[PDB]
């Protein structure tokens with residue numbers, strides 16, 4: 054009673070938003086130049102590139118990482134479509150990386166600048182690990198993971214035997230690199246973000262049937278993250294989120310591949326840790342669109358204030374990764390709970406995240422991937438372009454839209470699970486069945502399953518009845534059936550299905566009003582599983598299509614004060630009831646209640662809302678508390694927005710991407726978190742380059758009041774000797790040091806360096822903000 058999935062070859066998408074997203078991504082993938090993506094690999098192998106690498110992250114230290122994702126996305130797109138242009142690119146990319154691999158002859162393939170020197174040092178036990186760095190390199194373990202993954206996917210999806218041997222050679226190479234390292238050394242190294250290496254090493258174990266790769270997969274499992282999760286402890290506050298999710302996927306994969314390993318007793322524990330991780334992130338750390346994190350990090354689960362105020366809402370990779378995890382947990386959920394039927398609550402999550410975040414994260418006509426999806430009312434999101442943008446979210450973006458076929462159905466001997474209501478044709482070879490699902494969902498409630506071919510075996514269709522949603526029709530005849538539960542469940546329908554049979558059901562959709570999880574005054578409207586949003590305007594959408602600059606993934610355009618965005622006046626039940634469905638064949642709604650300030654509001658599915666500012670979460674105010682809530686918006690929030698709109702450059706020390714984007718250098722430095730803000734400090738020094746788009750007159754530095762450590766500040770190597778203005782401390786003990794610069798910083802770049810000022814350390818610096 055094992056549940057399994059269908060391959061992408063056996064699930065054809067029919068006309069729908071999902072097929073459109075697939076075709077749009079197909080065009081994006083084919084626009085990339087494989088000579089530019091291969092260039093880093095060929096360079097590190099001592100060969101001559103046929104073209105320059107791409108810029109952005111591909112020439113500032115993550116060189117090679119898109120090439121890995123590119124392999125994965127081509128392979129999956131190929132399995133999904135058979136597209137001949139796709140195969141030309143895959144065959145070329147693989148053969149170029151093969152030449153690279155053969156030129157060095159040890160198994161190594163890699164794009165990180167100075168790769169061979171790096172892995173030489175590591176092998177010798179010269180391990181200098183930070184959060185996002187290893188021996189001066191930018192997350193090289195994460196980088197090389199995308200190659201492992203890509204080669205795995207070329208083998209699994211496109212049947213490449215060449216990819217299979219390249220993968221085995223590359224894995225054997227890592228066994229050699231790590232053979233002289235102790236567990237303490239491995240665990241030290243793993244403090245640097247390493248993607249899901251443990252997952253891929255477990256995949257190689259399964260492909261080869263050789264346990265040495267399972268041993269390797271466990272050695273690459275980061276213990277400081279795993280052990281609390283085994284014990285149902287969420288210690289994720291302050292952690293970089295997309296760093297962790299692949300680790301957890303890997304723990305789960307190691308458990309799967311270890312199911313019948315007589316020499317290791319830990320499979321159930323590792324599975325459980327993955328299951329807890331999922332439960333805790335979904336139930337306490339996720340917003341209505343299915344994603345998590347603010348500025349790439351987990352914020353406290355009892356404080357979503359940053360999620361509603363910061364322009365850097367959920368990162369798309371994180372959701373991509375949660376969906377991968379969801380798929381693994383669902384599959385043996387019936388084994389784990391003893392029912393032998395999989396748990397549809399996983400599918401409720403998959404559906405929410407697929408329609409509302411994944412589908413929303415690609416510009417649907419031209420293409421372009423989203424990195425950050427703000428939940429702040431009245432902001433907008435930025436899209437990648439093929440030749441300019443080399444972000445992680447481009448990489449996972451390429452994969453996302455290749456594989457919408459993967460979770461629509463699942464099969465279990467003589468049972469088919471119908472999980473997603475996505476127009477599709479299924480080839481259920483195992484039971485000689487071909488089936489077509491037709492529906493306009495979510496713009497209509499009706500779903501039809503048609504049997505195109507069958508071999509008259511008795512089969513049970515398990516139709517998902519989501520919590521948000523019994524009369525079915527079979528060949529014109531109604532079969533009424535009684536609700537066993539209000540929870541998410543399956544309706545079984547068993548027949549000797551034959552060609553021409555037709556099953557029709559309806560999914561009743563209702564308006565709901567979902568509060569932000571910490572129960573502050575913010576709510577989002579849904580219709581069935583679809584998050585609605587309103588378009589608040591189309592001005593100041595700066596960089597909506599990104600250039601190749603560092604920080605180009607961020608929507609840096611003017612911030613609108615929250616008091617200029619519609620706030621909903623009244624109590625939640627009245628607000629819910631004031632939303633009314635407009636007629637037409639596409640979902641649209643008008644909000645007929647009191648809105649401050651008045652704009653009536655039209656709401657549409659967030660996944661169709663593009664090239665504009667929006668609100669998903671609306672601020673809400675009771676009639677009684679209106680005066681005090683509006684006054685806070687009109688004074689404190691208004692001033693915070695003034696501050697943002699005066700900011701020329703902004704760095705969050707201790708946060709990897711802001712640091713990387715400003716060319717972090719350091720000696721004898723550490724990072725951490727305190728009162729939910731990140732810091733960096735050093736006994737030596739740490740520096741960044743400020744990007745000065747407009748002339749700046751002030752430098753604002755945030756430190757803790759009670760920190761006795763002091764920093765000297767150098768600006769292009771000149772000591773800043775001006776006396777700062779010192780703010781009053783906030784609730785958490787933080788103060789701002791405002792330096793009025795003797796001369797205005799001129800447009801361009803300028804180094805800022807922090808050194809200890811007599812004390813053992815610099816001050817712990819929690820923010821660097823340059824102001825007009």
Ligand SMILES: OC[C@@H]1O[C@@H](O)[C@H](O)[C@H]1O
Nearest residue numbers: 192195295296349445710
């Ligand atoms: O560090 C590599 C990737 O880029 C990051 O900033 C993402 O959040 C992370 O997983």
Ligand SMILES: [Zn+2]
Nearest residue numbers: 368370445446
């Ligand atoms: Zn990303």
